[PDB]
């Protein structure tokens, strides 16, 4: 067999790591190769200082800043194969500079001889699938020769995020609007905000950090807005809550209770879509962001074609170790170790409960147990560790505890290892102190 | 017979009006599908506020900004067929804003009836040619229904553009820099940079009418900086040409003659590729940006497969009449009252012969006068009538004049139409006091 790969992010690296790990316990494995559209492997973890289009003209994938931190807890996403101690030669704090999980990442797949699977600076263009020839046939560019070539497959696992093409809505006096207008996917460097009064549009991760980035490295003032409900946190008192935007005129902000402010610069953190430049109708999944993925059985198995397969896909409580966890299990199918159901009605049906299932419920800790749920349905199936999953998920709520005290301070905690037993050791800086975000910084003295 | 136009702005859209003309003549054309990525037609002239990535996903177009005004002399593109007078029903001034522009584009078009063939929202995905067949076949994504199709075509005529996927250089201290670092492509409001010392690298139009637009609207200062040579024009008090930019050190940008200065924003004005993310290598066009297009026979058809065309693909002093006159060509050549040779070799020596005439002197007059002589060329060749080309020339040898006399002055200028043979009067409001940019103020009476 061939497999085709489809990025070399946490997730794709998870794919490649999964086969080697079979391979290396004596199984035979299929051809693997990985096509990756940027110049190294990291995904999301691979910081540029480009926006918009790279070097080679293709739509940057990194949606990652300066400054950025682990917005979890560490514990929550250890490879339950690779320990933090085991990388790092000891226990490190809990929310770690974007480097050093970088560092963590790419340290598990250059150890497992996997890279010389992968081709860099290769975008793919193309993947269709003859149902004659059972093959996908994936047509991809490398830029370093630039020459587009093709290649056929067996399978095909797609794991090219859904955290890059961003979702970017039009209100009123957005493009009358003389100051920076920008999405988070291109956000860089908070200093550019230093004095500046930022409207942060959004309710979620983005809008909580980015916001908070703009706080530590100077802003003037923070005003963020929502739609339905406030993100309802202990903000520090240059940052305010509004409800939804109506317009802008001039430098005034008008919000839905009739108060306006007046604003230097615009930060849209709106969130991203699932999108699939490279597919057609009929292999192309079609999802909200959710937990309980469209279209995959077990959320893994496209079902219009469950020879392909997509890692990540999900909206993500759980990350590194679900992905592991994703792979571990596509990597079974692929060696017919685990049976795919024949008949696509009962992969529907999968689906179906899955949906079900998420919607039973509202509360966040249910959120956040029916992905653990999901870990622990997948890891019972494969020879990946069976790890305490239960003890992520104490991670978890110790962590939306700690945010709920003081979202400014939330990242000076520290949790227990889940692989290893060890408390993170307190960091040596706390966090709004900690201007300097270098691995280096964070692991010496 | 089935032909694909690739791009809806100003020429795919002289395409439409070419095969629309012989129609309406009697002449039987080709079925005609044009797919145009964008919402409206318009190309590079139809404004968005957005940046990098679109409503939909792709990559933006636009690199037009607010403000922009036409930055040659009308009169030297004002259309053969089709009048400034007549469209707006009276004599306006000889540098157009954008919006004044796009409505000109837009009246000759609706007139034509051409929309019909348009598919807006409709990125082509790929275009793949089977030389057994002898057909092209296009596949598009359509963003309103989220469908992916393919369609068979004899011909595909790619007017795609070539100012939209920006060429963006590293210097040393771009990624670390404490500032607003922006291509040209992604520039839309100069008021963004009102107070601040802005350094503009390029030392062409883009380097230009950036910095004029800076200095117009209130920066501090600005220091453009050129590599090759100097754009030597008499600048204002606050503008400084430097030469080659070094490197930056924090804010300190330090040049090639050893002198340094402080600078709070970067705009990169260094240009665009030529790049079709949409093409395999049978059919992709490379070449520089410059009078004498790689691989184009007549300047339009691809040397490698002459059933496939290329519109406005060449570096432009001339603009919509040299894309009429390619497109009146490349219909005929499908019409089959044009025939190409049979012969490679003769393809690929009408290229190297347009290349060493344009390389036999570094005159600008000499420039200009050679695209002159293609458009007379590709005019005498087809039913598209001769117009006063000659006078053209003149208006842009005078333009060139007025900006060597004054480079923030020479918008406040009229030139004689060689369409209707009147000057053109003087604008209500000097360039430089004249900050609204809208078509109703401009054409306040
Ligand atoms: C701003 C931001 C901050 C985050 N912070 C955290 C955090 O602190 N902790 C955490 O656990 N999670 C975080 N995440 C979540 C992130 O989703 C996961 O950490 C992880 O990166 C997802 O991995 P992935 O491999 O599935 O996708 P990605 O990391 O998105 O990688 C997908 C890969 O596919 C490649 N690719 C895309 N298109 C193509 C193509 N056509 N051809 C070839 N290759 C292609 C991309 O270049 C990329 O390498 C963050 C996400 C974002 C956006
Ligand atoms: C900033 C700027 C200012 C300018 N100002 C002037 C001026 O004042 N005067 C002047 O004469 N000229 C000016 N020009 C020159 C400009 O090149 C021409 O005026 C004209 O716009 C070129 O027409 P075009 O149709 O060849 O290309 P474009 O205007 O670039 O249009 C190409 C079209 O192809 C579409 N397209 C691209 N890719 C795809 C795809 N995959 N699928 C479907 N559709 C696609 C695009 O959306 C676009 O509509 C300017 C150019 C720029 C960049
Ligand atoms: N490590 C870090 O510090 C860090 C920083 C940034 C992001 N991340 C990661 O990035 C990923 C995505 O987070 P995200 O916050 O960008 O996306 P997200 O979780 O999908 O949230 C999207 C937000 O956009 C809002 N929204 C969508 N459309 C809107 C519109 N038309 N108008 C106003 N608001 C709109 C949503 O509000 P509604 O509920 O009203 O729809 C929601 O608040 C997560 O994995 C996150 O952890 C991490
Ligand atoms: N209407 C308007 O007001 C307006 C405004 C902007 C643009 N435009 C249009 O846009 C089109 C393109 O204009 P343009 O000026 O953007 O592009 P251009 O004419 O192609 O010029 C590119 C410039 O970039 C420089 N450059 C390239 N690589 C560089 C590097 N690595 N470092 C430093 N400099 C580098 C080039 O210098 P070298 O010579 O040294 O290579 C050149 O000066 C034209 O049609 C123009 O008329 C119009």
Not at 285 to 310: E, S
Request: aromatic share 14%; glycine share 6%; net charge negative.
């Amino acid at each position: 067999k061939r497999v085709a790969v489809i990025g070399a992010g946490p997730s794709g690296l998870a794919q490649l790591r999964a086969f080697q790990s079979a391979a290396d316990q004596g199984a035979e494995i299929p051809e693997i190769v990985c096509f990756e559209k940027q110049a190294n492997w990291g995904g999301l973890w691979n910081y540029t200082w480009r926006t918009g289009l790279d070097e080679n003209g293709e739509p940057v994938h990194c949606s990652m800043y300066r400054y950025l931190w682990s917005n979890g807890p560490k514990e929550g996403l250890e490879f339950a194969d690779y320990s933090f101690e085991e990388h790092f030669g000891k226990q490190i704090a809990s929310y770690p500079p974007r480097a050093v999980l970088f560092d963590y990442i790419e340290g598990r797949v250059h150890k497992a001889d996997v890279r010389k699977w992968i081709r860099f600076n290769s975008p793919v263009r193309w993947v269709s699938y003859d149902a004659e020839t059972a093959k996908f046939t994936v047509t991809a560019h490398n830029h370093e020769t630039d020459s587009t070539y093709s290649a056929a497959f067996d399978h095909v696992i797609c794991a090219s995020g859904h955290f890059s093409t961003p979702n970017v809505p039009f209100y009123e006096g957005f493009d009358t609007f003389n100051g920076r207008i920008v999405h988070a996917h291109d956000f860089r460097d908070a200093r550019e905000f230093e004095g500046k009064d930022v409207l942060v549009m959004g309710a979620s991760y983005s809008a909580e950090d980015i916001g908070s980035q703009c706080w530590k490295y100077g802003a003037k003032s923070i005003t963020s807005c929502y739609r339905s409900a406030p993100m309802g946190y202990a903000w520090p008192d240059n940052w305010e809550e509004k409800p939804a935007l109506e317009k802008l005129t001039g430098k005034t902000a008008h919000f839905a209770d009739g108060s306006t402010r007046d604003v230097d610069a615009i930060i849209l953190c709106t969130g991203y879509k699932h999108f699939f430049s490279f597919l057609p109708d009929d292999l192309r999944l079609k999802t909200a962001n959710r937990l309980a993925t469209a279209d995959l059985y077990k959320g893994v198995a496209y079902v219009h074609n469950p020879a392909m397969f997509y890692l990540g896909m999900q909206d993500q409580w759980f990350t590194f170790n679900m992905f592991d966890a994703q792979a571990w299990w596509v990597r079974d199918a692929i060696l017919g170790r685990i049976t795919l159901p024949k008949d696509k009605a009962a992969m529907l049906a999968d689906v179906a409960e899955r949906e079900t299932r998420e919607e039973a419920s509202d509360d966040v800790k249910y959120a956040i147990r029916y992905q653990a749920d999901y870990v622990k349905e997948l890891v019972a199936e494969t020879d990946y560790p069976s790890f305490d999953i239960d003890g992520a998920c104490d991670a978890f709520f110790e962590w939306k505890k700690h945010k709920a005290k003081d979202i400014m301070a939330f990242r000076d905690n520290s949790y227990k290892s889940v692989i290893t037993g060890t408390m993170a050791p307190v960091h040596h800086t706390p966090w709004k102190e900690a201007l300097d975000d270098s691995m280096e910084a964070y692991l010496q003295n």
